[PDB]
């Protein structure tokens, strides 16, 4: 389970290769589930499959 | 003088990464094939619903922009200015000079900010008091008209300034283009690396 600045769900957090631009904080699925998230402290990108 | 916008002026609408997806977005954009102004002593221009601004010259003859209702210190105004050491933005009540150049103002009465840090493309939005600047720099082989092909502006800074803006002006020193946004539905081709690579202005034709 996770909370990321309020983004809340259940997932297998994986080190993302998705190339977020420095302003972007979330990435989204066609359903508007959140597909990847920037860590709010290490600023790395994580997949949320 | 007037010219073609040639599909220049698209920017990333949301701070969400999307990739290999065509996404419909409703926002203020420069409409496609818009009829933009080109300026070849110094105009004051309306801000409209929002501004697209660009200039082709690397020699830093342009130095900034000022925005407000009055541009005369009877209210606040935004000043965006660039100097030999810093990017600078502030929201002070400047007594601006009738030609503002680097000497941009005689005096100032209050302030609430001091942010700091060859075609140059800019978009300015003001919604919910957030004055949002997007830009990109793009190569060109001609000066008198905007270049062919697609170009997405990345967000540069996003400031909660909250002042009323209706007129603006560009700072020189001792050519540029202006267009204005309108509410459009756009379809954005986000590629595999999540960059917008093409778009459709759905209300065009
Ligand atoms: C933003 O500024 C404009 C002026 O640039 C304001 O327009 C004036 O509003 C008053 C009433 O408050 C009218 O009496 C004037 O005739 C208006 N002037 C013009 C040129 O239209 C506008 O009200 C301001 N808006 C906000 C939300 O502050
Ligand atoms: C560019 O503008 C900034 C102000 O936004 C200037 O920065 C100040 O410089 C003085 C020294 O001259 C410092 O004491 C201040 O602390 C600086 N302020 C900030 C906010 O950094 C800068 O000097 C200007 N550069 C030029 C070449 O004019
Ligand atoms: C900074 O701006 C405020 C307004 O936002 C000024 O406040 C006004 O001051 C005059 C006297 O100069 C008063 O008659 C008004 O009633 C004040 N307005 C409000 C809303 O309180 C303030 O004076 C400005 N600062 C300076 C140094 O001029
Ligand atoms: C998405 O990004 C990759 C890099 O991560 C791009 O591939 C590189 O492109 C440059 C030229 O612009 C080459 O020098 C690299 O060797 C390429 N790397 C690989 C691994 O092929 C790719 O072109 C981008 N995709 C799109 C559609 O622009
Ligand atoms: C926040 O924490 C990280 C370590 O997780 C640290 O590197 C960083 O400096 C901290 N933020 C600030 C503003 O110091
Ligand atoms: C561009 O707009 C101006 C008025 O805004 C008009 O005079 C001019 O003819 C227009 N040009 C084209 C090609 O439509």
């Amino acid at each position: 389970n996770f909370n990321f600045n309020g983004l809340t769900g259940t997932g297998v957090l994986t080190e993302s290769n998705k190339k977020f631009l420095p302003f972007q904080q979330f990435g989204r699925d066609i359903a508007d589930t959140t597909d990847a998230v920037r860590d709010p402290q290490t600023l790395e990108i994580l997949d949320i499959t | 003088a007037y010219t073609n916008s040639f599909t220049r002026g698209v920017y990333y609408p949301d701070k969400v990464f999307r990739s290999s997806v065509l996404h419909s977005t409703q926002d203020l954009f420069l409409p496609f094939f818009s009829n933009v102004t080109w300026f070849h002593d110094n105009p004051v221009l309306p801000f409209n619903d929002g501004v697209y601004f660009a200039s082709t010259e690397k020699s830093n003859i342009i130095r900034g922009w000022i925005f407000g209702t009055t541009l005369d210190s009877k209210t606040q105004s935004l000043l965006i200015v660039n100097n030999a050491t810093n990017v600078v933005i502030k929201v002070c009540e400047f007594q601006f000079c009738n030609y503002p150049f680097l000497r941009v103002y005689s005096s100032a009465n209050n302030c609430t900010f001091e942010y700091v840090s060859n075609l140059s493309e800019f978009v300015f939005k003001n919604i919910d008091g957030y004055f949002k600047i997007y830009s990109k720099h793009t190569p060109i082989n001609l000066v008198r008209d905007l270049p062919q092909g697609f170009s997405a502006l990345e967000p540069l800074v996003d400031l909660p300034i909250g002042i009323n803006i209706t007129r603006f002006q560009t700072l020189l020193a001792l050519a540029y283009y202006v267009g204005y946004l309108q509410p459009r539905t756009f379809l954005l081709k986000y590629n595999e690396n999540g960059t917008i690579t093409d778009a459709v202005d759905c209300a065009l034709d």
Side-chain angles (χ1 to χ4, degrees), chain B residues 16 20 31 34 47 64 75 78 88-89 100-101 108 152 184-185 189 193:
Chain B
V16 178
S20 301
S34 286
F47 190 78
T75 68
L78 181 69
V88 179
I89 301 179
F101 69 92
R184 299 293 266 214
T185 303
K189 185 176 175 70
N193 296 331

Side-chain angles (χ1 to χ4, degrees), chain B residues 68-70 164-167:
Chain B
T69 57
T70 75
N164 183 9
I165 287 164
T166 58
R167 290 185 287 188

Side-chain angles (χ1 to χ4, degrees), chain A residues 13-46:
Chain A
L13 302 182
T14 303
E15 304 196 330
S16 192
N17 57 351
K18 299 186 186 213
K19 302 169 194 169
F20 277 32
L21 289 73
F23 62 94
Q24 299 173 330
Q25 306 305 319
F26 305 107
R28 280 189 186 190
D29 176 30
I30 306 299
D32 294 274
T33 74
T34 293
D35 185 46
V37 67
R38 185 182 298 276
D39 179 280
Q41 299 186 0
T42 65
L43 304 174
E44 72 198 89
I45 310 308
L46 306 175

Side-chain angles (χ1 to χ4, degrees), chain B:
Chain B
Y2 279 76
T3 203
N4 181 21
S5 76
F6 211 165
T7 78
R8 294 280 157 157
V10 186
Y11 65 89
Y12 295 88
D14 53 346
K15 303 195 186 185
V16 178
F17 179 89
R18 301 178 192 269
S19 67
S20 301
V21 62
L22 309 184
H23 186 256
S24 300
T25 184
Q26 208 287 0
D27 215 338
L28 297 179
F29 296 102
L30 184 68
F32 275 7
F33 302 93
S34 286
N35 193 11
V36 311
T37 298
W38 174 71
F39 297 99
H40 301 163
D41 300 341
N42 53 285
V44 62
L45 302 177
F47 190 78
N48 207 315
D49 293 346
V51 176
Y52 172 93
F53 176 108
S55 177
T56 58
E57 62 197 319
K58 67 177 177 71
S59 306
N60 301 323
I61 306 303
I62 289 159
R63 294 293 179 125
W65 307 261
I66 56 171
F67 313 77
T69 57
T70 75
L71 305 177
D72 77 353
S73 78
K74 301 191 193 98
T75 68
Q76 287 183 286
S77 288
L78 181 69
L79 169 68
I80 300 181
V81 72
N82 185 58
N83 78 28
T85 59
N86 298 101
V87 181
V88 179
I89 301 179
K90 56 208 302 176
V91 194
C92 321
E93 296 191 308
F94 295 111
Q95 181 75 345
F96 293 122
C97 299
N98 189 54
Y99 176 29
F101 69 92
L102 292 188
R103 297 186 182 194
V104 174
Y105 51 82
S106 303
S107 58
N109 193 74
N110 276 296
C111 207
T112 318
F113 233 108
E114 183 156 44
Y115 167 91
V116 166
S117 175
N118 295 316
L119 175 66
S120 54
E121 303 193 61
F122 301 87
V123 162
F124 312 142
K125 305 179 74 175
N126 187 0
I127 291 179
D128 299 339
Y130 299 82
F131 191 99
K132 309 188 181 282
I133 298 114
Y134 312 75
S135 70
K136 180 167 284 284
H137 299 177
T138 189
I140 47 161
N141 307 89
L142 82 176
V143 168
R144 71 179 296 277
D145 203 3
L146 294 170
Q148 186 168 11
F150 198 81
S151 171
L153 313 191
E154 292 170 39
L156 186 69
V157 73
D158 184 345
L159 300 173
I161 74 175
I163 61 155
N164 183 9
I165 287 164
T166 58
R167 290 185 287 188
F168 89 101
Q169 170 162 209
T170 297
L171 278 48
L172 306 182
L174 295 180
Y176 71 86
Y177 300 91
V178 163
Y180 298 117
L181 312 181
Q182 298 180 225
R184 299 293 266 214
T185 303
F186 264 64
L187 179 75
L188 305 182
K189 185 176 175 70
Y190 290 103
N191 80 339
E192 67 185 345
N193 296 331
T195 68
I196 308 160
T197 53
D198 203 355
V200 183
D201 178 7
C202 306
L204 179 68
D205 67 14

